[PDB]
Amino acid sequence: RPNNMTRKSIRIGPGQTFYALNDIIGDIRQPHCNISKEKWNNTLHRVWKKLV
Amino acid sequence: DIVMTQTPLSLPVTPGEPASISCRSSQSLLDSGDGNTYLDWYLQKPGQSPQPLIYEVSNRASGVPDRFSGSGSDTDFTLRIRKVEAEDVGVYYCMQYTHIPWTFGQGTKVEIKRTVAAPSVFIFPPSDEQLKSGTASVVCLLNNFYPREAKVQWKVDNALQSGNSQESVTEQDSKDSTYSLSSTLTLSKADYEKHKVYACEVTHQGLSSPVTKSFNRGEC
Amino acid sequence: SSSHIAMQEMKNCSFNMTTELRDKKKKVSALFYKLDIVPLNKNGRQYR
Amino acid sequence: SSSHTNAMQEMKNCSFNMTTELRDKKKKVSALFYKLDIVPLNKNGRQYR
Amino acid sequence: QVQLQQWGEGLVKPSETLSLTCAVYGGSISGDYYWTWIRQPPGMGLEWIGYIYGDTASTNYNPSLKNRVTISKDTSKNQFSLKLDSVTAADTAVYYCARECGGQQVLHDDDYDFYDPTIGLDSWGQGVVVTVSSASTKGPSVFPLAPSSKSTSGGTAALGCLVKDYFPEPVTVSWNSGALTSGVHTFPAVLQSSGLYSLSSVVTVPSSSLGTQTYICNVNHKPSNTKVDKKVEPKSCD
Ligand SMILES: *[C@@H]1O[C@H](CO)[C@@H](O[C@@H]2O[C@H](CO)[C@@H](O[C@@H]3O[C@H](CO[C@H]4O[C@H](CO)[C@@H](O)[C@H](O)[C@@H]4O)[C@@H](O)[C@H](O[C@H]4O[C@H](CO)[C@@H](O)[C@H](O)[C@@H]4O[C@H]4O[C@H](CO)[C@@H](O)[C@H](O)[C@@H]4O)[C@@H]3O)[C@H](O)[C@H]2NC(C)=O)[C@H](O)[C@H]1NC(C)=O
Ligand SMILES: *[C@@H]1O[C@H](CO)[C@@H](O[C@@H]2O[C@H](CO)[C@@H](O[C@@H]3O[C@H](CO[C@H]4O[C@H](CO)[C@@H](O)[C@H](O)[C@@H]4O)[C@@H](O)[C@H](O[C@H]4O[C@H](CO)[C@@H](O)[C@H](O)[C@@H]4O)[C@@H]3O)[C@H](O)[C@H]2NC(C)=O)[C@H](O)[C@H]1NC(C)=O
Ligand SMILES: *[C@@H]1O[C@H](CO)[C@@H](O[C@@H]2O[C@H](CO)[C@@H](O[C@@H]3O[C@H](CO)[C@@H](O)[C@H](O)[C@@H]3O)[C@H](O)[C@H]2NC(C)=O)[C@H](O)[C@H]1NC(C)=O
Ligand SMILES: *[C@@H]1O[C@H](CO)[C@@H](O[C@@H]2O[C@H](CO)[C@@H](O[C@@H]3O[C@H](CO)[C@@H](O)[C@H](O)[C@@H]3O)[C@H](O)[C@H]2NC(C)=O)[C@H](O)[C@H]1NC(C)=O
Ligand SMILES: *[C@@H]1O[C@H](CO)[C@@H](O[C@@H]2O[C@H](CO)[C@@H](O)[C@H](O)[C@H]2NC(C)=O)[C@H](O)[C@H]1NC(C)=O
Ligand SMILES: *[C@@H]1O[C@H](CO)[C@@H](O)[C@H](O)[C@H]1NC(C)=O
Ligand SMILES: *[C@@H]1O[C@H](CO)[C@@H](O)[C@H](O)[C@H]1NC(C)=O
């Protein structure tokens, strides 16, 4: 998750706090996951062979 | 009295880049009576009344763009401008009102950052009409320079002066983002006529070596 | 506020909530993902 | 009280709205509280908690 | 929000009493509002003077000035005023009247009793310049900052007018009745040890136009009602 986020405390009631989201530091960049293309292709090929 | 420290005292920022202002308090601002953190941010644009920016740490004011956004828990507070624009130039104050008295911060002067430019120096000897008045003032004018820092030293026949020159700086120009400085040296009549050579020496980042402009009295 | 998926993914939101005393409501605000809020009416101003 | 006019600052007379058996009705009740168990809300010294 | 229009006497003698008034339009002065006075010394940061509560008469003051400040309100006229006694030179500043929304607004026929809008100083006055000086109003003196060969750099010549020994602020300086605006710099005034003011209004023009274009500076001082038109020409090498 590339970006830093800032928290905020809001008093729900007696001794209760609700941590909400304040803002995003810097330009917004979407989160993502990286998987090696060759390794994943090999794994999918193997499971395809087994399914065949 | 809560002492409210603002850093930096000057924040030169080029439009399009983020800016961050930090403000610290000597005591926790979490009000014990009702649990609210009473810290506000205000922006005093050049020659205008202060205007509200942020209420109680994070709650944005009314009509304030989305780029402004504050934060902080109880002693370290931060105001962030996501994308500085040319209309965000001004002084930013962090005010606490948890404890009496309410104390403002020192004030961060946000300005526009541009390329370093060397000053153009001119000298204006006192005129004969001012000569008739019994007092004389010589001004050495620096025009369109950046950064605003500039050391002006008055030498009278190669003798440094002290406690006799007053410096005035205009605000940053809205067109070229350059400053203008003028230092004036005021002296009486025996003091004017007792010396011949008058010069103002300027020191600036944009100048490789100090530049001295001089005039000789009684000559053009 | 995005430079310009992740642009519409989030929403400013202002609401009223109970304080530590259950007789006073305080106007607070927060940032909510659009996946956590459902529009109430069709005018696109009130969510829950 | 009459004796107060004659450590009576140790207590305060606090009146507050209390919800009745019906959730849509409130009754202005009163009670006496020790000053050690109440703190001010504002600096005006009229409203406590 | 609320429009706050304030007036008062902006020029007080030392050891006298400064009396400023702030009028409220578009709202009621009776409520959960803290009517605040804040002053900004020339060149310094903001400083808090005090406030008066809207509902009750509870007033709080700056501890440094707690023995001189008195803030009162007039609900009938919807105005609140500041009185500052035994003023000194340290009391020169610009005074703003503000409003801080309190945290216990009274709610009518709602589920709750009170309401905290989470609002600070949302309304500000335009400010009143206050100068604590014993010097009497005086007319400005306009002197020609004549261009010369010493004030030329790359074919650009600098000229101007020096306005000195005037009181109080401000002075409006223009060139050629406002025709010339480019390159005009009016430096902020300064306060000497004599209690007067002086400033320089310079302008950069091409050197070739020195002898063809007539340069005149118009200096106006409203408090003393003085208008001086001074012509600036290169010094005559007689
Ligand atoms: C427990 O629960 C009770 C019951 O709900 C609750 O009591 C309520 O207290 C409030 C606060 O005192 C009372 O509100 C009063 O209402 C009127 C004005 O409101 C009228 O008009 C508005 C429209 O403008 C209507 O919406 C509303 O329904 C009313 O018709 C006044 O009596 C009071 O206001 C005056 O005094 C205030 C304080 O001085 C001022 O802020 C306000 O501006 C008004 O000033 C007037 O009087 C001043 C002198 O007193 C004078 O200087 C001014 O010029 C002006 O003439 C007040 O707002 C509300 O009615 C009460 N409810 C009942 C049923 O009586 C408690 O607050 C609650 N909590 C506790 C802890 O007990
Ligand atoms: C959090 O909690 C606060 C406090 O309760 C809420 O703020 C209230 O919000 C409501 C709804 O927006 C506000 O009511 C509006 O107020 C305005 C002024 O109206 C007053 O004055 C007129 C006479 O001029 C009266 O008729 C009216 O009853 C009010 O006394 C106007 O914007 C609105 O009235 C206009 O529109 C409506 C329909 O749109 C018409 O019926 C009216 O006749 C009139 O044309 C409306 O009444 C209320 O004032 C707010 N309270 C306070 C104390 O400010 C927040 O909304 C709530 N939620 C959030 C998310 O913050
Ligand atoms: C997952 O993989 C992607 C690529 O498929 C990564 O994105 C790429 O990250 C690199 C390294 O940060 C970026 O290069 C750099 O970008 C900027 C200029 O664009 C600058 O910092 C450097 O000069 C450098 O070029 C690259 O732009 C970026 N995007 C692409 C499309 O390649 C991503 O970081 C990976 N994520 C993880 C968690 O490993
Ligand atoms: C909930 O509210 C109560 C009541 O306001 C809070 O108690 C307060 O805690 C502060 C902590 O700083 C106390 O201040 C301290 O007081 C003395 C000197 O008076 C000394 O120990 C310290 O120098 C400091 O100033 C304050 O007195 C105290 N008030 C009472 C009535 O006990 C409490 O902290 C709040 N709790 C939370 C979790 O916020
Ligand atoms: C993923 O890996 C497999 C491994 O089998 C690759 O399969 C190739 O398939 C082509 C025809 O489609 C054959 O000519 C190649 O000999 C195969 N390669 C091997 C190593 O057996 C496949 O190309 C890879 N990539 C993708 C995108 O599927
Ligand atoms: C969120 O930010 C936008 C953009 O500045 C602003 O107009 C809006 O009022 C904010 N939302 C709320 C609920 O205040
Ligand atoms: C109680 O009330 C009486 C009558 O108003 C007053 O004289 C007296 O001082 C009060 N006593 C207190 C506040 O202790």
DSSP summary character for residue D35: G
Do E14 and E131 contact (CB within 8 A), yes or no? Answer: no
Specify whether the CB–CB gap between E122 and B61 falls below 8 A.
yes
CB contact under 8 A, C23 and E112: yes
- Is C23–D49 a contact, with Cβ atoms under 8 angstroms apart? no
Q: Of D30, B35, D47, which Cα lies nearest the Cα of E105?
A: D47
Record the resolution, in angstroms: 3.0
Could you tell me the two tokens for E14? Answer: 């030392």
Q: What is the dihedral of CA E175, E176, E179, E185, to 10 degrees?
A: -10
Task: Classify A3 in phi/psi space as left (phi over 0), alpha (psi -120 to 50) or beta.
Answer: beta
Residue D30: is it exposed, middle or buried by C-beta count within 10 angstroms (0-12/13-18/19+)? Answer: exposed
| CB-side neighbour CA atoms (13 Å) of E121 | 29
CA–centroid distance, C37 to ligand 4, in Å, is 38
DSSP E119: -
The closest residue, in CA terms, to atom 59 on ligand 2 is: C15
Answer whether C27 sits within 8 Å of E118, measured CB to CB.
Answer: yes
Shortest-distance atom of ligand 4 to CA D36: 31
Task: Tell me, using a 6 A CB cutoff, whether residue A42 lines ligand 5.
Answer: yes
Q: What is the DSSP letter of A39?
A: H
Using a CB–CB cutoff of 8 Å, tell me whether D15 touches chain C. no
Residue type, B159: A
Q: Do C17 and A12 touch (CB under 8 A)?
A: yes
CA E103 – CA B38 distance, rounded (Å) = 11
Q: How far is CA A30 from CA A21, B38, B210, C2, C13, in A?
A: 16, 34, 52, 11, 21
DSSP annotation string for E147-174: --GGGEETTEEEEEEEEEEEBSS--EEE
Cα distances (Å, whole numbers) of residue E48 to B97, E9, E54: 10, 20, 18
Chain C partners within 8 Å of D49 (Cβ)? 20-21
Is there a contact between A22 and C31 (Cβ–Cβ < 8 Å)? yes
DSSP state of E68: T
Q: Does D49 touch chain C (CB under 8 A)?
A: yes
Checking B87-93 for CB contacts under 8 A at 24+ apart, the result is: B88/B19, B88/B43, B89/B45, B89/B46, B89/B172, B90/B43, B90/B44, B90/B45, B90/B46, B91/B43, B91/B44, B92/B6, B92/B21, B92/B41, B92/B42, B92/B43, B92/B53, B93/B6, B93/B41, B93/B42, B93/B44, B93/B50, B93/E45, B93/E46
User: How many Å is the Cα radius of gyration of chain B?
Assistant: 23
Q: How far is C23 from chain E (nearest CA, A)?
A: 5
Separation between Cα atoms, residue E130 and residue B208, nearest integer Å: 44
Do the Cβ atoms of D40 and B33 come within 8 Å?
A: yes
**E205-217: b (≥16 Cβ within 10 Å) or e:** bebeebeeeebbb
Residue E119 sits at the vertex; the CA angle it makes with E115 and E121, to the nearest 5 degrees, is 135
Q: Can you tell me whether residue E63 is helix, strand or coil?
A: helix
CA separation for the pair B213, B142 (Å, rounded): 11
Pairing of the two strands C24-33 and E114-116: parallel
At E117, list the tokens. Answer: 């809008």
The torsion angle over the Cα atoms of residues B131, B133, B138 and B139, rounded to 10 degrees, is -130
Experimentally determined by: cryo-EM
Residue nearest to atom 6 of ligand 7 (CA): D5
- The reply to whether E145 touches chain B by the CB within 8 Å rule is yes
Tokens read off for E28:
């009621």
Is there a contact between B54 and B61 (Cβ–Cβ < 8 Å)?
Answer: yes
Do E95 and E134 touch, CB atoms closer than 8 A? no
CA-wise closest residue to D44 among B156, B52, E56, B48:
E56
Cβ of E30 closer than 6 Å to ligand 1, yes or no, is: yes
Query: Counting beta carbons within 10 angstroms of the beta carbon of residue B188, is it exposed (0 to 12), middle (13 to 18) or buried (19 or more)?
Result: exposed
The answer to whether E170 and E187 have CB atoms below 8 angstroms apart is: no
Q: C42: which residues sit within 8 A by CB, 6+ positions away?
A: none
Q: Which residues contact B163 (CB under 8 A, 6 or more apart)?
A: none
Residue E212 has which token pair? 């063809």
Q: Is the C-beta atom of B32 inside 6 A of ligand 4?
A: yes
- Closest ligand 6 atom to B67 CA: 5
Instruction: Using alpha carbons, select from B10, B207, B15 the residue that is nearest to residue B110.
Output: B10
Please choose, from the candidates B128, B123, B211, B196, the residue with its C-alpha nearest in 3D space to the C-alpha of residue E200.
B123
- Count the residues in chain E: 238
Chain C nearest-CA distance from D25, in A, is: 13
Task: Report CA-CA distances (Å) from B210 to B93, B163, B165, B201, B204.
Answer: 36, 21, 18, 6, 7
